[PDB]
């Protein structure tokens, strides 16, 4: 986040299709969370740090 | 130029165009770099001098398109190889000489010792007669 | 078995160094049991158990 604090590099990465990739990884994260909920109800705490950071 | 490539160019152009009037801001060179082609600072500075008039919100896609046609990843540089032979020959020697090359070298911040300038010229001279005309530089560029 | 499949007993968490060491101890106990049989002992030696244990 520090390296892309300028909209210049945000737009550059946008040209490389970073948002689709991030959204794709966000999409995968929520599917993984649903798999976890179908699995044993483990109360993980950092549960969603990756999701929150990608969002 | 295939429609695929020109579409990609306009896609990046718009991504960097915040004006919304099909004119980039600063981010013109950034579109250039993102579009795969990686121009050196000199190449970029030169392109900006080409669009120095107006620009920064007045750079139309055709303008940038003409710029990239002039240099599609520098695929065709022959038009400017003879131009550089003329520039390198500041005294218009008509042949490659170490002094003018060393001058060009020092002008680029490269303080080549005669020893290096020498290897350079020796390699540049196909017949090793002390004189290197357009043909020898063109053969180097073909190598 | 449907209720058991839904939920039954308790399970350990991931990266459980403590439970991972407990499973290692169970492996040691099982291998000490198996090694008694000479054929099993030779098979385990051929596996490479000695180097792993060392
Ligand atoms: Ca000269
Ligand atoms: Ca000659």
Short mmCIF file of C-alpha atoms and ligand atoms in Angstrom, two decimals:
data_model
loop_
_atom_site.label_atom_id
_atom_site.label_comp_id
_atom_site.label_asym_id
_atom_site.label_seq_id
_atom_site.Cartn_x
_atom_site.Cartn_y
_atom_site.Cartn_z
CA UNK A 1 0.00 0.00 0.00
CA UNK A 2 2.90 2.38 0.65
CA UNK A 3 4.41 1.72 -2.79
CA UNK A 4 1.10 2.40 -4.59
CA UNK A 5 0.01 5.39 -2.47
CA UNK A 6 0.24 7.45 -5.66
CA UNK A 7 -2.67 7.08 -8.09
CA UNK A 8 0.00 6.93 -10.81
CA UNK A 9 1.07 3.41 -9.85
CA UNK A 10 -2.48 2.39 -8.95
CA UNK A 11 -3.50 3.19 -12.54
CA UNK A 12 -0.41 1.41 -13.87
CA UNK A 13 -1.31 -1.76 -11.93
CA UNK A 14 -4.97 -1.28 -13.04
CA UNK A 15 -3.67 -1.38 -16.66
CA UNK A 16 -2.02 -4.73 -15.76
CA UNK A 17 -5.41 -6.07 -14.52
CA UNK A 18 -4.62 -6.04 -10.75
CA UNK A 19 -8.28 -5.33 -9.74
CA UNK A 20 -9.62 -8.42 -11.63
CA UNK A 21 -6.82 -10.47 -9.97
CA UNK A 22 -7.58 -9.01 -6.49
CA UNK A 23 -11.34 -9.55 -7.04
CA UNK A 24 -10.60 -13.08 -8.33
CA UNK A 25 -8.52 -13.76 -5.18
CA UNK A 26 -11.31 -12.07 -3.08
CA UNK A 27 -13.80 -14.42 -4.79
CA UNK A 28 -11.65 -17.48 -4.00
CA UNK A 29 -11.30 -16.30 -0.34
CA UNK A 30 -15.12 -16.22 0.28
CA UNK A 31 -15.55 -19.69 -1.32
CA UNK A 32 -12.76 -20.98 0.99
CA UNK A 33 -14.60 -19.39 3.98
CA UNK A 34 -17.87 -21.17 2.98
CA UNK A 35 -15.91 -24.46 2.74
CA UNK A 36 -14.57 -23.73 6.27
CA UNK A 37 -18.13 -23.05 7.60
CA UNK A 38 -19.34 -26.38 6.05
CA UNK A 39 -16.32 -27.92 7.85
CA UNK A 40 -15.95 -27.95 11.68
CA UNK A 41 -16.89 -24.57 13.24
CA UNK A 42 -13.32 -23.48 14.20
CA UNK A 43 -13.45 -19.91 15.64
CA UNK A 44 -10.32 -18.58 13.87
CA UNK A 45 -9.59 -14.92 14.81
CA UNK A 46 -7.42 -13.68 11.89
CA UNK A 47 -10.35 -15.27 10.00
CA UNK A 48 -10.84 -12.68 7.29
CA UNK A 49 -7.58 -10.76 7.47
CA UNK A 50 -6.77 -11.80 3.89
CA UNK A 51 -10.33 -11.01 2.80
CA UNK A 52 -10.36 -7.64 4.56
CA UNK A 53 -6.96 -6.72 3.14
CA UNK A 54 -7.88 -7.70 -0.42
CA UNK A 55 -11.11 -5.70 -0.16
CA UNK B 1 -1.41 -2.51 -36.46
CA UNK B 2 -4.09 -5.10 -35.51
CA UNK B 3 -7.37 -3.90 -33.94
CA UNK B 4 -6.41 -5.98 -30.84
CA UNK B 5 -3.23 -3.91 -30.18
CA UNK B 6 -4.86 -0.49 -30.94
CA UNK B 7 -7.74 -1.46 -28.58
CA UNK B 8 -5.20 -2.31 -25.82
CA UNK B 9 -3.47 1.07 -26.44
CA UNK B 10 -6.79 2.97 -26.12
CA UNK B 11 -7.74 0.81 -23.08
CA UNK B 12 -4.55 1.90 -21.23
CA UNK B 13 -4.89 5.44 -22.66
CA UNK B 14 -8.37 5.77 -21.09
CA UNK B 15 -7.24 4.07 -17.82
CA UNK B 16 -4.65 6.90 -17.47
CA UNK B 17 -7.01 9.54 -18.98
CA UNK B 18 -8.61 11.30 -15.95
CA UNK B 19 -9.77 14.26 -18.13
CA UNK B 20 -12.36 11.91 -19.71
CA UNK B 21 -11.93 13.88 -22.97
CA UNK B 22 -9.72 11.13 -24.48
CA UNK B 23 -6.67 13.08 -23.21
CA UNK B 24 -4.18 11.71 -20.59
CA UNK B 25 -2.68 14.01 -17.89
CA UNK B 26 2.15 12.92 -16.45
CA UNK B 27 0.48 9.53 -17.11
CA UNK B 28 1.23 9.70 -20.90
CA UNK B 29 4.68 8.18 -20.31
CA UNK B 30 2.97 5.78 -17.89
CA UNK B 31 0.58 4.52 -20.62
CA UNK B 32 3.73 4.17 -22.76
CA UNK B 33 5.53 1.97 -20.15
CA UNK B 34 2.41 -0.10 -19.20
CA UNK B 35 1.86 -0.92 -22.92
CA UNK B 36 4.86 -3.30 -22.65
CA UNK B 37 7.20 -0.90 -24.53
CA UNK B 38 9.78 0.38 -21.97
CA UNK B 39 11.31 3.66 -23.32
CA UNK B 40 14.50 5.07 -21.69
CA UNK B 41 14.31 8.46 -19.89
CA UNK B 42 15.86 10.12 -23.00
CA UNK B 43 13.31 8.43 -25.34
CA UNK B 44 10.46 9.51 -22.99
CA UNK B 45 11.76 13.10 -22.50
CA UNK B 46 12.05 13.32 -26.33
CA UNK B 47 8.43 12.09 -26.79
CA UNK B 48 7.22 14.69 -24.22
CA UNK B 49 9.10 17.42 -26.18
CA UNK B 50 7.10 16.21 -29.25
CA UNK B 51 3.82 16.76 -27.29
CA UNK B 52 5.22 19.75 -25.29
CA UNK B 53 2.77 22.01 -27.19
CA UNK B 54 -0.48 21.91 -25.12
CA UNK B 55 -0.49 18.34 -23.70
CA UNK B 56 -1.21 17.42 -20.03
CA UNK B 57 -4.96 17.05 -20.75
CA UNK B 58 -4.66 17.91 -24.47
CA UNK B 59 -2.80 14.73 -25.55
CA UNK B 60 -5.32 13.02 -27.92
CA UNK B 61 -5.07 9.24 -28.58
CA UNK B 62 -4.13 9.84 -32.29
CA UNK B 63 -1.30 12.09 -31.00
CA UNK B 64 -0.03 9.21 -28.77
CA UNK B 65 -0.84 6.80 -31.65
CA UNK B 66 1.37 8.83 -34.06
CA UNK B 67 4.10 8.88 -31.38
CA UNK B 68 4.06 5.04 -31.03
CA UNK B 69 3.94 4.64 -34.86
CA UNK B 70 7.16 6.71 -34.98
CA UNK B 71 8.56 4.07 -32.53
CA UNK B 72 6.60 0.77 -32.17
CA UNK B 73 9.01 -0.53 -29.45
CA UNK B 74 11.80 1.03 -31.61
CA UNK B 75 11.35 -1.82 -34.14
CA UNK B 76 12.27 0.50 -37.05
CA UNK B 77 15.20 2.83 -36.16
CA UNK B 78 16.91 2.91 -39.62
CA UNK B 79 15.24 6.29 -40.37
CA UNK B 80 17.28 7.65 -37.41
CA UNK B 81 20.48 5.52 -37.79
CA UNK B 82 21.77 7.92 -40.52
CA UNK B 83 20.48 10.83 -38.37
CA UNK B 84 22.68 9.58 -35.46
CA UNK B 85 25.66 9.05 -37.81
CA UNK B 86 25.23 12.76 -38.67
CA UNK B 87 24.84 13.71 -34.94
CA UNK B 88 27.78 11.54 -33.75
CA UNK B 89 29.84 13.21 -36.55
CA UNK B 90 29.53 16.64 -34.82
CA UNK B 91 32.43 17.94 -37.01
CA UNK B 92 30.90 16.09 -40.01
CA UNK B 93 34.01 13.87 -40.36
CA UNK B 94 32.06 11.49 -42.65
CA UNK B 95 33.67 8.55 -40.77
CA UNK B 96 33.53 7.28 -37.15
CA UNK B 97 36.39 8.92 -35.17
CA UNK B 98 37.33 8.19 -31.50
CA UNK B 99 37.40 11.88 -30.45
CA UNK B 100 33.74 12.58 -31.44
CA UNK B 101 32.63 9.16 -30.08
CA UNK B 102 34.50 9.91 -26.80
CA UNK B 103 32.79 13.36 -26.82
CA UNK B 104 29.38 11.64 -27.29
CA UNK B 105 30.39 9.09 -24.59
CA UNK B 106 31.39 11.83 -22.08
CA UNK B 107 28.17 13.70 -23.03
CA UNK B 108 26.25 10.58 -21.85
CA UNK B 109 28.25 10.73 -18.57
CA UNK B 110 30.28 7.73 -19.81
CA UNK B 111 33.96 8.80 -19.41
CA UNK B 112 35.37 5.95 -21.59
CA UNK B 113 39.20 5.79 -21.39
CA UNK B 114 40.88 6.07 -24.81
CA UNK B 115 41.59 2.32 -24.30
CA UNK B 116 37.89 1.63 -24.45
CA UNK B 117 37.24 4.18 -27.08
CA UNK B 118 39.85 2.31 -29.01
CA UNK B 119 38.29 -1.08 -28.78
CA UNK B 120 35.10 0.53 -29.84
CA UNK B 121 36.49 2.08 -32.93
CA UNK B 122 38.59 -1.02 -33.77
CA UNK B 123 35.40 -3.17 -33.68
CA UNK B 124 33.47 -0.46 -35.61
CA UNK B 125 36.15 -0.48 -38.36
CA UNK B 126 35.35 -3.49 -40.64
CA UNK B 127 38.50 -2.91 -42.79
CA UNK B 128 40.45 -1.43 -39.83
CA UNK B 129 41.70 1.52 -41.95
CA UNK B 130 40.96 4.12 -39.21
CA UNK B 131 37.74 5.34 -40.94
CA UNK B 132 34.16 4.04 -40.31
CA UNK B 133 31.42 5.25 -42.74
CA UNK B 134 27.60 4.76 -42.69
CA UNK B 135 27.90 1.17 -44.04
CA UNK B 136 29.99 -0.09 -41.05
CA UNK B 137 27.52 1.34 -38.45
CA UNK B 138 24.59 -0.13 -40.47
CA UNK B 139 26.35 -3.56 -40.44
CA UNK B 140 26.79 -3.23 -36.63
CA UNK B 141 23.02 -2.45 -36.31
CA UNK B 142 22.19 -5.52 -38.49
CA UNK B 143 24.47 -7.88 -36.50
CA UNK C 1 -24.43 -41.83 11.55
CA UNK C 2 -26.01 -38.65 10.05
CA UNK C 3 -25.77 -36.82 13.43
CA UNK C 4 -22.14 -38.06 13.83
CA UNK C 5 -21.36 -36.74 10.29
CA UNK C 6 -23.02 -33.39 11.22
CA UNK C 7 -21.03 -33.07 14.49
CA UNK C 8 -19.39 -35.54 16.93
CA UNK C 9 -16.68 -35.16 19.64
CA UNK C 10 -13.92 -32.54 19.13
CA UNK C 11 -10.97 -32.07 16.72
CA UNK C 12 -7.56 -30.33 17.06
CA UNK C 13 -6.74 -27.02 15.27
CA UNK C 14 -4.28 -26.63 12.33
CA UNK C 15 -0.53 -26.17 13.04
CA UNK C 16 -1.11 -27.77 16.50
CA UNK C 17 2.55 -28.18 17.64
CA UNK C 18 1.26 -29.83 20.86
CA UNK C 19 -1.17 -32.25 19.15
CA UNK C 20 1.39 -32.68 16.30
CA UNK C 21 3.83 -33.86 18.97
CA UNK C 22 1.16 -36.10 20.47
CA UNK C 23 0.63 -37.71 17.05
CA UNK C 24 4.40 -38.11 16.80
CA UNK C 25 4.37 -39.94 20.15
CA UNK C 26 1.57 -42.17 18.89
CA UNK C 27 3.66 -42.93 15.80
CA UNK C 28 6.60 -43.88 18.03
CA UNK C 29 4.38 -46.19 20.09
CA UNK C 30 2.92 -47.82 16.97
CA UNK C 31 6.38 -48.31 15.45
CA UNK C 32 7.69 -49.82 18.68
CA UNK C 33 4.77 -52.23 18.42
CA UNK C 34 5.38 -53.07 14.75
CA UNK C 35 9.16 -53.47 15.07
CA UNK C 36 8.60 -56.56 17.22
CA UNK C 37 7.65 -58.59 14.15
CA UNK C 38 10.95 -59.37 12.34
CA UNK C 39 9.47 -59.00 8.85
CA UNK C 40 7.86 -55.68 9.78
CA UNK C 41 11.18 -54.67 11.36
CA UNK C 42 13.08 -55.34 8.13
CA UNK C 43 10.42 -53.52 6.11
CA UNK C 44 10.61 -50.46 8.38
CA UNK C 45 14.41 -50.45 8.16
CA UNK C 46 14.13 -50.61 4.36
CA UNK C 47 11.73 -47.65 4.51
CA UNK C 48 14.39 -45.45 6.10
CA UNK C 49 12.99 -45.29 9.61
CA UNK C 50 16.40 -45.38 11.31
CA UNK C 51 17.63 -42.18 9.65
CA UNK C 52 14.35 -40.36 10.34
CA UNK C 53 14.43 -41.36 14.02
CA UNK C 54 18.10 -40.37 14.29
CA1 LIG D 1 34.46 13.42 -37.53
CA1 LIG D 2 35.49 2.81 -44.88
#
